[PDB]
Amino acid sequence: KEATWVTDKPLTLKIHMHFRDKWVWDENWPVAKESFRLTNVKLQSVANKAATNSQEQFNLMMASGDLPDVVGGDNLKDKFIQYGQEGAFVPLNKLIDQYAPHIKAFFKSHPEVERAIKAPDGNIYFIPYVPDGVVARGYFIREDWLKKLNLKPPQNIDELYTVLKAFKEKDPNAAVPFIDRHPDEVFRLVNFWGARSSGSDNYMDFYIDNGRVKHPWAETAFRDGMKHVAQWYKEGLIDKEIFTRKARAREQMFGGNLGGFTHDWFASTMTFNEGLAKTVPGFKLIPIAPPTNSKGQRWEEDSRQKVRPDGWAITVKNKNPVETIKFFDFYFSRPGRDISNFGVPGVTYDIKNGKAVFKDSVLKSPQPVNNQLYDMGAQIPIGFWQDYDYERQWTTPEAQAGIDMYVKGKYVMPGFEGVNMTREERAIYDKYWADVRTYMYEMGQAWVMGTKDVDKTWDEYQRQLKLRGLYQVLQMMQQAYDRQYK
Ligand X SMILES: O=C(O)C1=C[C@H](O)[C@H](O)[C@H](O[C@H]2[C@H](O)[C@H](O)[C@H](O[C@H]3[C@H](O)[C@H](O)[C@H](O)O[C@@H]3C(=O)O)O[C@@H]2C(=O)O)O1
Options 65-73, 264-272, 322-330, 471-479: segment touching ligand X (CB under 6 A)? 264-272
Contact between 75 and ligand X (CB under 6 A)? yes
3-state secondary structure of 140: strand
370 touches ligand X (CB under 6 A): yes
Residue 463: CB minimum distance to ligand X, A: 28
CA 28 – CA 25 distance, rounded (Å): 9
Give the pairing of strands 355-358 and 70-73.
unpaired
- Which residue number, 267 or 477, has a Cβ lying nearer to ligand X? 267
Return the sign of the alpha-carbon dihedral for residues 447, 301, 371, 331: negative
Which stretches within 235-359 are classed as H helix?
242-245, 249-253, 266-275, 321-330, 334-342
The nearer residue to ligand X, 164 or 339, going by C-beta atoms, is: 339
Quick one: 17 or 267, whose CB is closer to ligand X?
267
Number of residues that bind ligand X (CB under 6 A): 10
Alpha helices in 170-235 (DSSP H): 185-188, 220-234
Smallest separation (angstroms) from ligand X to the CB of 342: 12
Per DSSP, what are the bridge partners of residue 156? 292
Shortest distance, CB of residue 260 to ligand X, whole angstroms?
19
Stretch that binds ligand X, among 111-119, 150-158, 262-270, 439-447 (CB under 6 A): 262-270
From CA 55, how far away is CA 41, in angstroms rounded? Answer: 26
Q: Please, which residue, 75 or 464, has the CB nearer to ligand X?
A: 75
Is 34 or 205 the residue whose CB approaches ligand X more closely?
Answer: 205
Task: State the Cα–Cα distance between residues 396 and 411, nearest whole angstrom.
Answer: 21
- Asked if 387 interacts with ligand X (CB under 6 A), we say no
Report the SS3 class of residue 72: strand
Tell me the C-alpha to C-alpha distance, in Å, between residue 143 and each of 21, 47, 149: 33, 44, 10
The contact pattern for ligand X, residues 145-184, with x = CB under 6 A and - = no contact, is -------------------------------------x--
Between 20 and 33, whose beta carbon lies closer to ligand X?
20
Residue 268 binding ligand X, by CB under 6 A: yes
By CB under 6 A, tell whether 391 contacts ligand X. Answer: yes
Residues within window 45-74 making contact with ligand X, judged by CB under 6 A: 74
Q: Which of 45, 85, 379, 478 binds ligand X (CB under 6 A)?
A: 379
Listed in sequence order, the DSSP H helices in 89-184 are 93-99, 101-109, 111-117, 143-148, 157-169
Q: How far is CA 414 from CA 134, 407, 417, in A?
A: 11, 12, 9
Continuous H helices in 254-333: 266-275, 321-330
191 binds ligand X (CB under 6 A): no
- Using the rule CB under 6 A, which residue among 265, 328, 332, 433 binds ligand X? 265
* Site residues (vs ligand X, CB under 6 A): 20, 74-75, 182, 265, 267-268, 370, 379, 391
